[PDB]
Design a protein around this ligand. Structure first.
Ligand SMILES: Nc1ccn([C@H]2C[C@H](O)[C@@H](COP(=O)(O)NP(=O)(O)OP(=O)(O)O)O2)c(=O)n1
Ligand SMILES: [Mg+2]
Ligand code: NA
Ligand code: NA
Length: 327
DNA sequence: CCGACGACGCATCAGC
DNA sequence: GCTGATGCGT
DNA sequence: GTCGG
């Protein structure tokens, strides 16, 4: 639909969601508020009453009353209060620093650290991740236009083919689905000499090559299969330098690759929905494998998979190309 | 009345 | 030193 | 907070 339909409500709910997550540490309330925010945002009518909203799946008694108060007044008493509160809003803001979750956020505020100024004053108290997350607080919230994503793909695909001819690299996420802008870069990676029954340097080599040509600039986390770091396009001539971007690189076994590709292509709203349909039909899908569900609920062995299409050729559905996986 | 609610890799932490 | 728990991002 | 056992 349109934002301004029930945008006031969805915003109200989203604000509520973030406070539950970051201040109350109630993750399931946070997901509840979001589920309501989503189902309402897709509801093609202007909500007249909280009772009208209650009819939707995921909207219950509490939110219904919250909508009554909002429609009748244009705001929420509890929300205006938590906004003006120094301690709760400070906690809520710090979690925007990647690396700082709700726990570390409350630690800082409890000992008097409430702002980025305070953080920068006390960098010794921060761990590695939090220093990077703070360093690029600005950049990490900027979006990435597809144009810059394509150039990034160019480098990633080239540097990967340069390390070993037989690597298979795929940029997934919203990029693959076609989104004109993206929040980060999701790279998926495999290699013929890595399977379920199979060097612990396959991911390392790729990462360090991307470091040598100065694409990857910082490291948040690196293991044998998963990489989280930062990357930056080379500056264009006169033009002012590019923002630093988040990049993830995952090394997946060859036989688990297309399940992984399917999963990290998304959207999560699409995934969450393919999983059930998969259920209905007697199949369970994760990021690793698709497995048949038996008489009881017993999982047999994972079926052979050689394409995304193969996976639809188990739940008897016809291909939906990444372009249309909006949800 | 009450439990589920998504689950996993990696970094640091609690503890032995 | 180690194992296991917790926090974190996603 | 919502849904459903
Ligand atoms: N909480 C989440 C969110 C997404 N995912 C999955 C499905 C996503 O499409 C895929 C990549 O995650 P992502 O980078 O956060 N989202 P996506 O690329 O689809 O959109 P952006 O915000 O990155 O532009 O992993 C997940 O496993 N757990
Ligand atoms: Mg992405
Ligand atoms: Na309802
Ligand atoms: Na954060």
């Amino acid at each position: 639909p349109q934002e301004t339909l029930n945008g006031g409500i969805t915003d109200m709910l989203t604000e509520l969601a973030n406070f539950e997550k970051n201040v109350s540490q109630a993750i399931h309330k946070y997901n509840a508020y979001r589920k309501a925010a989503s189902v309402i945002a897709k509801y093609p009518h202007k909500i007249k009453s909280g009772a009208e909203a209650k009819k939707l799946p995921g909207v219950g008694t509490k939110i219904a009353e919250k909508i009554d108060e909002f429609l009748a007044t244009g705001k929420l008493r509890k929300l205006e209060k938590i906004r003006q509160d120094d301690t709760s809003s400070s906690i809520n803001f710090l979690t925007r620093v990647s690396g700082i979750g709700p726990s570390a956020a409350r630690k800082f505020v409890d000992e008097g650290i409430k702002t980025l100024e305070d953080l920068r004053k006390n960098e010794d108290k921060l761990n590695h991740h939090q220093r990077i997350g703070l360093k690029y607080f600005g950049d990490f919230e900027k979006r990435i236009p597809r144009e810059e994503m394509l150039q990034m793909q160019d480098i990633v695909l080239n540097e990967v083919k340069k390390v070993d001819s037989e690597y298979i690299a795929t940029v997934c996420g919203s990029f693959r689905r076609g989104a004109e802008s993206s929040g980060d870069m999701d790279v998926l990676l495999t290699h013929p000499s890595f399977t379920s029954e199979s060097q612990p340097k396959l991911l390392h080599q790729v990462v360090e090559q991307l470091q040598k040509v100065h694409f990857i600039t910082d490291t948040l986390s690196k293991g044998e299969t998963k990489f989280m770091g930062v990357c930056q396009l080379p500056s264009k001539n006169d033009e002012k330098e590019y923002p630093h971007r988040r990049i993830d690189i995952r090394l997946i076994p060859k036989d688990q690759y297309y399940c992984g590709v399917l999963y990290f292509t998304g959207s999560d709203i699409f995934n969450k929905n393919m999983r059930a349909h998969a259920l209905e039909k007697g199949f369970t899908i994760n990021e690793y494998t698709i497995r048949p569900l038996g008489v009881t609920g017993v999982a047999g062995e994972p079926l052979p998979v050689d394409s995304e299409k193969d996976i639809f050729d188990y739940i008897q559905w016809k291909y939906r190309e990444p372009k249309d996986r909006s949800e």
